[PDB]
Amino acid sequence: PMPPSEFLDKLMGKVSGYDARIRPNFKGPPVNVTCNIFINSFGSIAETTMDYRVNIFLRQQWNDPRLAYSEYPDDSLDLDPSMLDSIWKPDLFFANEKGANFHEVTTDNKLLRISKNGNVLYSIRITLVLACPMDLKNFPMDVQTCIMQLESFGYTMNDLIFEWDEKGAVQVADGLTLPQFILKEEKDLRYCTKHYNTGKFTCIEARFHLERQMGYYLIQMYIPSLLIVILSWVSFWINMDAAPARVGLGITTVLTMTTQSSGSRASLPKVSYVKAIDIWMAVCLLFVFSALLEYAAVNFIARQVEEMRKLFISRAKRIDTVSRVAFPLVFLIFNIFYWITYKII
Amino acid sequence: PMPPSEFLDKLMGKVSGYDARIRPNFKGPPVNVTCNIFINSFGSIAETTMDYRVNIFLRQQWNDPRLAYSEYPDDSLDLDPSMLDSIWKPDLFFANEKGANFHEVTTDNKLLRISKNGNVLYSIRITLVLACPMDLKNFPMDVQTCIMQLESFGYTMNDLIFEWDEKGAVQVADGLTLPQFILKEEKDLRYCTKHYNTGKFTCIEARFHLERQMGYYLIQMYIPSLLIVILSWVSFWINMDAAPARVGLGITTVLTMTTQSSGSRASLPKVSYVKAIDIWMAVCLLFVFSALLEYAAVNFIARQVEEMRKLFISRAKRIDTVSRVAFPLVFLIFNIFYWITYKII
Amino acid sequence: PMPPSEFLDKLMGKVSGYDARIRPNFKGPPVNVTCNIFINSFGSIAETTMDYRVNIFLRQQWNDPRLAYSEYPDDSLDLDPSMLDSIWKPDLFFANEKGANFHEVTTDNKLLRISKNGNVLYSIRITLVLACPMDLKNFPMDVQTCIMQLESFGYTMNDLIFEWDEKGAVQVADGLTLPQFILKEEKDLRYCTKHYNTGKFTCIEARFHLERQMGYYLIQMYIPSLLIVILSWVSFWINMDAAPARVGLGITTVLTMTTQSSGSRASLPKVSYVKAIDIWMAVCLLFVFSALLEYAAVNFIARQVEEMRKLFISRAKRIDTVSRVAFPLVFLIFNIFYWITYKII
Amino acid sequence: PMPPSEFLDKLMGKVSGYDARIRPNFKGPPVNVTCNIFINSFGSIAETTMDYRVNIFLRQQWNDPRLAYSEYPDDSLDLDPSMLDSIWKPDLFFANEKGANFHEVTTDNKLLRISKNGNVLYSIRITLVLACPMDLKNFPMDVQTCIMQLESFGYTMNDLIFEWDEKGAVQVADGLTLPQFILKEEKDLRYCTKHYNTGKFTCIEARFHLERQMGYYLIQMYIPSLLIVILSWVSFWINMDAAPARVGLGITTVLTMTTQSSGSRASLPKVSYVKAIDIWMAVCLLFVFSALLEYAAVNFIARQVEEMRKLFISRAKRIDTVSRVAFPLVFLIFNIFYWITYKII
Amino acid sequence: PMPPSEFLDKLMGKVSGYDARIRPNFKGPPVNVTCNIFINSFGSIAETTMDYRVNIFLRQQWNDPRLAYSEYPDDSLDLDPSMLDSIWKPDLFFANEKGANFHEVTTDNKLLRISKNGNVLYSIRITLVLACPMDLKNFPMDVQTCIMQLESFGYTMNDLIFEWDEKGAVQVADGLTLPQFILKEEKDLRYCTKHYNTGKFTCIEARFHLERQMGYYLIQMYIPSLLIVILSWVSFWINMDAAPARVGLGITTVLTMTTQSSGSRASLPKVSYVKAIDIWMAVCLLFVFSALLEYAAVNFIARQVEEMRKLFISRAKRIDTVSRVAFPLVFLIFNIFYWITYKII
Ligand SMILES: *[C@@H]1O[C@H](CO)[C@@H](O[C@@H]2O[C@H](CO)[C@@H](O[C@@H]3O[C@H](CO)[C@@H](O)[C@H](O)[C@@H]3O)[C@H](O)[C@H]2NC(C)=O)[C@H](O)[C@H]1NC(C)=O
Ligand SMILES: *[C@@H]1O[C@H](CO)[C@@H](O[C@@H]2O[C@H](CO)[C@@H](O[C@@H]3O[C@H](CO)[C@@H](O)[C@H](O)[C@@H]3O)[C@H](O)[C@H]2NC(C)=O)[C@H](O)[C@H]1NC(C)=O
Ligand SMILES: *[C@@H]1O[C@H](CO)[C@@H](O[C@@H]2O[C@H](CO)[C@@H](O[C@@H]3O[C@H](CO)[C@@H](O)[C@H](O)[C@@H]3O)[C@H](O)[C@H]2NC(C)=O)[C@H](O)[C@H]1NC(C)=O
Ligand SMILES: *[C@@H]1O[C@H](CO)[C@@H](O[C@@H]2O[C@H](CO)[C@@H](O[C@@H]3O[C@H](CO)[C@@H](O)[C@H](O)[C@@H]3O)[C@H](O)[C@H]2NC(C)=O)[C@H](O)[C@H]1NC(C)=O
Ligand SMILES: *[C@@H]1O[C@H](CO)[C@@H](O[C@@H]2O[C@H](CO)[C@@H](O[C@@H]3O[C@H](CO)[C@@H](O)[C@H](O)[C@@H]3O)[C@H](O)[C@H]2NC(C)=O)[C@H](O)[C@H]1NC(C)=O
């Protein structure tokens, strides 16, 4: 029979000389560790901090020949997660953690099973707040590439090597969605081998190609800033010569743009370059700034003979018949050159 | 007599070979674990994060025949919560925790009693910050369905199965209320069995049908945005022909709507679809945007013969006698089609 | 002599069979635990969360006859707080903790002394963030009743009963004050016995009758909203007939009320009922909304014969001589009915 | 020789009967503990919470005759900070901690040396978030007195007494500065002996006299509120009789004061009394509120004979020649009485 | 052979008398500890708190002759990071931590190797939130010098001395960048030896010369405040004599500057001195405040004979022909003196 109480201690403890402080295949080749991650929760992709919180099941597989068993009849032993403090485990860390933690609610969220030949499957639940540097040039239409790279902190490349396994290195939960992005399906899997003045260390990362749902920004930034571009066109059809209302209408619209432009970047890092939403909020700040300046020409020109008196006002109304149509052709010639530049990535 | 000092150690320790690393009924059927939760505190249902904090008493019951006792005369042993580190306990976890913790103030908030036949009751106090993806299409009248699902992380479906017990799987505190929602009474109880590339794992979740108290939004969003819809009607009865006040009144009301519309979504996630409060705050942004545009017609028309001079102004006042009544019929024909669409779920 | 080194171990350890896993008077009556709390720090009474942080010295007293000593000559043993992990201690918890923690700076902040007859005094320092549901109907003049109830999580009512002691169950620090409230002196002390499907459990709570310092709100909400009620009275004495200023003055005052009304509830939960500060900020939103509407009558009436021309304007100035005095009598007849309703609780 | 390996264990362990659970001089006089603190970091003096974070080196000295050594030749033993779990240590705590923690980065930040006669020096690094109730009557010119008091939680006054040592009880880091305050040099050192219903307990506190750098408030509150007091003087020199601009200029300035007054207390607790910055922001709210009201007199008076027509307007311009100079004498007679009241503490 | 299981215990444990509580070279010279840091993550350089979060690999090297081995054939032993609790380690701490923590995700992020002669390499991953006092005189063009100094808390200068090693004391990650600053390449390395009343303690710090990316501030503060400086120039070309629009245009521009000036310092500490962005936001607050005051002269002068009537208005238009060009020469003579003062550091 060989009950399971004795078999457990006969594999880890003083008998058989298992020493969890000494890696497998000592004084031999490296310990080929194949990895893959399941993603439960993805999101909270902040940009004030330029990080993102993920929740994964880190699986790992290596081969420890000291963990070989033939006395037992079946082909696997999913064991107590309290066993994990007794076997060797690779010292994987996330080279851009910025804060990570296990989960220990009602039990350690850990798994451990050991095939007959000695293979190990070590799945643990982790929450990471990974650091990815956002490139925000073409901001509302950007395609971020946030990474997560799994280094080794203490074993060099000739003692512990990581790998992704061939059959589906990165799964995703069945209905996993994001509030603002959409995780594209192709997930890169490339090496990131590290060299320090201590030596070289195994590294393997997995690129995630995020992508913004532009829909939210077509409802708060673009449309609400395309109306005020139209109110600045209201300052033309009124009285045809002059009034304090045109200056009033002009001054107010320039007020909203200044306030609305500031609120546009209210929740972004203070990057030192001009991003895509800036030139929009800058061009719409001209066509409002031009109307209030356009009136300054006519009212100045109007307050400036026997027969030239009638033609004198034609010097002004000839403007308002051009400005009233010159603007809505330039804003539409710009607005088509804009979206073709960013929808062409 | 058999005092309780000796009886405790005679059930757990080296005698009798209890091994807390090996589940009950080893090499046999699964371990049928029946669960139910008491809910002390429910609330803080955030939406910037799309999660909610709960505070529950997780009860559990299974059957461990090794914990059977006949030497003792009474029918239960509510034991020391320090005992829990010595018996088998299922590795239940909350598949969408997003952060959970026990409570250990003045003692571990844990319970443990063991009937004669071997049944176990294991009640622990937990605080969870569970993740539920909010569907915010019809926002102020939405009916969220936030879940909480109790998986098993290390034992497969042929070694540990969960269940809800038939008699009241989900109680609630006696006077439990919510600040913004109302927890409906019917609580779904369905299976959520999981398949990974490690195997299959037992899962059972409990749907909670939340529902917004719409009263708060009929005091800050709808009513305060129904007044400014009326001030935009003030721009009609004044002077009957033209004045800088009508442009002034019109410009200001459009200012409030833009600011108030932005503040409407000041505390929501940046979802990429149009929600119910948006089309209201958009339609009320037209009827203000139309009045300021409506004046642009009359003032343009007025500043445009022997007998046609009197009828010429009738070309304008015929407008203001229609606009002054055409608007308050369209806003009321829309406002009835709106609330019938959302009160019909 | 019997030095204190040997006497300590002779009371707890293997000798005498003290078993901290087994309550006093086993198989007998319950363990009458008398409690009382000293309050160091009270405050941070939030309402976005509807909780409050307290800092207390929880004292407890029971009787453990196994802790009786006659070899020692003196009448008390204030002992090492490291002793507390060795004696029985009731598993008191705070049924609405929402987060609590001990203090362990320079030592565990714990006390322990043991009279000769076996009494125990167990004082520990705790920080609690207790949950009290705020009732905010009459908001700036409300009288909250936040509680704190001390249940037992694992022992049923026939094995552990709590009580408040008769001589001053709830002290308070000598000069303890609050930033916004004033802790009234009478502190209720009533039972809160709990019944679950596990059994019944001892409970005893202590009501604290908070009460708002209304002074802060008579400086930011009421007075700053009583001036703008007066500026809306400025729109009467100017020009006696009409001007764009009256519409200008009216429009601006309605702007401030809308903005100021929103800021009034800027730091409150989104309760689904109308609170006391709302009807004030609503009534003051009418008397501003009426002036801007009051001008719409006169200016409409004025722009509407041989002898009736002079009496025609009297149709308007008869208004402004009434509105200029009708308002400051209604606002004062309302303002007296308001404060009598809320100062009468 | 007597190497240091054996000498350490010969002082703490089973030999010599050192019992860290029993204070020095048992059954004798109290244990005179002399204290002093070095202050590394001081600041983050919040007022929404009314607390302040400090970072100190708590030194302590007492006399434990059991720690006397003559076998060793030198006059001190700066020992391993892992030793501290083995000797007696007074249970000092900070009676207004509100949250404190050790530092354990690269080692416990702890010190321990033991002179020959038995003296002990026990220096530990601590971060405290101490609670000091702010008195904000004369707010921008206030002089806070935040304290920190070092009580004993478990030993009564006849078993453990604290003291400050005579030679410099409170040092400060060499270039320690504060962002908003300036820590005055005199630091009070007085007793705070406590009496509870458990007994009396040793206490000694150290007052810190903070003091605000008023410079920041002479750049955002006072100067920016002294300009708008001047724009309200702009409403006099324009047109000498009346215009919609004066009402426009008046209405806008009253707008800024209301908004700016609210922003003045944007980051303060909701205290129930009138603070110094309030009467300034209230008096400047009158001189703007008076100009807009001052125009209401003239414009009302102007729109009210054969020879009295010319003198009739003199009834108005006599005002504007007084108001244009009466104001800038009252604002300067108030502004001198103000600063003499608060610069005289 | 001498397998690695026995060799490990033969170096640390009871054999050979290694005592981790006693430094190397006891009763001899100090323990020369050479340090260097690798910087993974740098950033979150806050200023409300005046701190910055870093993420480093602290390496250390000393010489412990008790850790000498000749039985083993190879020249290094990268060992289990669980070994670190058994060897001597210097008690380095960061004298301005303000909060630090190790990383323990999937293993302690620690390294340990031991050359044959006894050298030790001890690399650990750390996250620090270091305190650097910001000097914000010339704010958007400032050059901060944030430090990090590595003291010894318990060993005096005659028992433990730190040093930087000569070959590259401070590396940086390969593509490390910052959101707002740029870490200059020269990194100072100077001593900071400390003297307390406990003795003297080894200290060595490393200055980091940060430097602001001024680009962000040329897009939100300077340019958006250079437009409104131009709108205040719009108040000249309109009507050449007077209008309510000029007062309207003037009043509004002064509004934006006041609001925009406040928002300029919306995210900075309340420093008690005038910083560089203040005099810009103050000078631009004059040229707007002068235009609204400039109109007060002309409109006052205009409303003030047979032949002097025509020359009387020339007394006013002579102004507007000077003010319309006097301003854009002073703003450009100031604007060149400004940037030469701050680009000259
Ligand atoms: C872990 O994975 C590595 C790489 O996949 C394995 O290294 C490879 O080991 C094989 C033998 O097992 C080597 O083949 C031998 O190479 C020599 C040249 O040195 C050549 O004469 C023959 O082809 C011979 O078979 C192979 O070179 C070597 N490759 C590398 C890149 O190291 C390693 O064996 C794996 N270890 C375990 C425990 O699985
Ligand atoms: C835990 O619960 C499961 C499901 O309720 C139990 O499994 C059931 O066990 C019974 C016997 O105890 C099985 O009945 C037997 O089924 C065979 C077909 O395999 C049929 O010839 C007879 O009806 C026979 O009685 C039943 O099939 C089986 N059902 C399932 C779905 O597994 C299990 O016994 C419970 N274990 C414990 C320890 O309570
Ligand atoms: C803890 O407190 C409870 C309640 O104060 C005590 O219970 C009381 O115990 C007394 C005896 O000690 C009981 O008196 C006896 O009652 C019977 C009826 O059952 C009657 O024939 C006599 O009056 C007799 O003296 C009393 O009934 C009982 N009351 C309750 C409510 O339980 C308990 O003894 C205390 N235990 C300790 C260890 O202090
Ligand atoms: C700790 O400090 C306290 C106070 O500084 C010390 O108490 C003092 O102890 C001395 C003797 O060591 C006492 O002197 C004796 O007083 C009696 C009156 O009771 C009088 O007849 C003589 O003057 C005699 O010398 C002194 O009164 C006493 N004072 C107080 C306030 O307690 C204590 O000895 C110190 N303990 C240690 C271990 O240093
Ligand atoms: C740790 O580093 C310090 C400083 O680099 C070393 O101290 C130096 O030790 C050498 C001998 O090893 C001393 O040389 C001797 O100095 C005497 C004067 O006292 C002079 O007669 C000779 O030049 C003699 O060689 C040197 O003075 C001394 N310097 C200092 C500043 O202490 C120390 O030896 C190093 N310890 C280890 C374990 O590496």
Question: Can you characterise this structure?
Answer:
5 copies of one chain form a homopentamer. The first copy, chain A, is an alpha+beta fold. The first copy, chain A, contains 6 helices and 15 strands. In chain A, the strands form 5 sheets. In chain A, strands 1, 2, 4, 5, 6, 7 and 10 form a 7-stranded mixed sheet that branches. The longest helix of chain A is centred in the last third of the chain and has 35 residues, at 308-342. Chain A is rod-shaped, with a radius of gyration of 33 Å. The first copy, chain A, starts with a helix and ends with a helix. The interface between A and E is large, with 61 and 59 residues. A molecule of 3 linked components (NAG-NAG-BMA) binds next to loops of chain D. Chains A, B, C, D, E: It catalyses: chloride(in) = chloride(out). Chains A, B, C, D, E: Strychnine binds at residues 196-201.
